[model samples]
Target: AHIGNYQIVKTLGEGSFGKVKLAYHTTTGQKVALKIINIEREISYLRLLRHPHIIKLYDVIKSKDEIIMVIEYAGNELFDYIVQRDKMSEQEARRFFQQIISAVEYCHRHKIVHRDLKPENLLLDEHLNVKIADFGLNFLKTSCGSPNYAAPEVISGKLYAGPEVDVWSCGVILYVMLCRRLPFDDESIPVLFKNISNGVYTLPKFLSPGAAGLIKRMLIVNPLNRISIHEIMQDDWFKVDLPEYLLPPDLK
Candidate 1:
């Protein structure tokens, strides 16, 4: 079956919303993903974000019963990569973090906030570079990706501007990359939420002071005082071997 200018190839993954299919462009034959969803607002968020590190929405078509979003295809998610590798060196995690922070900075600049930022939503291309997906949110309390990655404001049922919450999630993601475990994990959801709300997570002794320091700043319980994207870009550890492309145009 075909959706718009795409030829359906195979099913990629199915979620609570619907199925995401592997497809190819009829003309260029380039592989793309067809995410059959049910929204008009979500499409608008993807349409405006054109960063190289973020998933690209090539086209959108309205079907009889669904909305087919043709997006750039990536074969792997950061979740699988982290699990398979168990963990990574500070150098390796820095590279991924650089890409993620760059993309998140771009989104915030455009006045869009990715309420859901976690390993599952972060895709990796053939080269293992990061490609962030999923920017829309609300019903956020129940639909959060993993409580481990959520900020204090998120679980406390408080409102947030967006950037700070994303930074907190990034901190959790960075922690998982180096520690191979969730920072605020527990058997019960309520306990986990309490752990996060209290900002009670132990940094492994193996982590260097610089890396550990960065995590502490991002995972602050008070979003108002949390480090912003600008400050993170200037962080010494984060700047180590950072690619020139990921730097903001003004700074580059």
Candidate 2:
């Protein structure tokens, strides 16, 4: 099977949203993820992004009904990895966090905000490097989904500075990585929204002092008071074993 210049080898995933197939570059045989999407904003934003930690958009083929996005094939979903591991060591989580934050910082500098950042949107390559996906919805737009990782201000329908909301989600993601459970969770949507809006969650005593403090700073109910990307980069917990490539070119 084929779509555009890719030869379909297997189905990576299929859902109501669209189909993602594992495909190969016809000539080079390089593996890629062929995603058939009924979307546009995703394409626009993806074309503007490029980083080692962000999934690459190699090419696009358009049709009246759908668009095939040729993306880097990140073999594993972070969601599945976290589920199987139950939790991760602080050192391991910090490594993933470093990549995620680095990419987020890059996006923010370009005036692009990822309204959504969850384990499900995070993928891993052979080296387990983080590749952020799904930038379909963002700033000034309301995403009435995934309350678990959303910030208080986001769920409350208030205007927000773009980067603050992302920082809040990153906090939730760090919590899940460390605890293997959502920081704000409930079976009922109403209760879930309330919990998120109120910023009510428990940090297990087992967390290291550095982790607990960082989470507290990130999950602040007031978006203005929440830790900014600059602050996160300076954080002792976040700076541990920071990779040189993640730094600005001047620093590197």
Pick the lDDT winner: 1
Task: Summarize candidate 1's per-residue lDDT along 18-63 as a digit string, tens digits.
Answer: 3478888899988888877665677786688889898888887888
RMSD of 1: 3.2
Residue-wise C-alpha lDDT for candidate 2, range 1-252, written one tens digit per residue: 977777888876421113478888899989888877665676787788888888888888886688777888877888788788756799999999889888888888777754566556688887888887755523345445466776777777775556788898889888988888888879998899898887889999999999999999999888888889878988998888998888655446
What's the TM-score of every candidate structure?
0.85, 0.84
- Which predicted model would earn the best TM-score? 1
TM-score, cand. 2 vs. native: 0.84
Predictions in order: lDDT = 0.81, 0.79
After superposing candidate 2, which stretches have Cα over 4 Å from the reference?
A: 2-5, 14-17, 37-44, 61-67, 135-143, 158-161, 249-252
- By summed lDDT, which 10 consecutive residues of candidate 1 come out lowest? 11-20
Candidate 2: what lDDT? 0.79
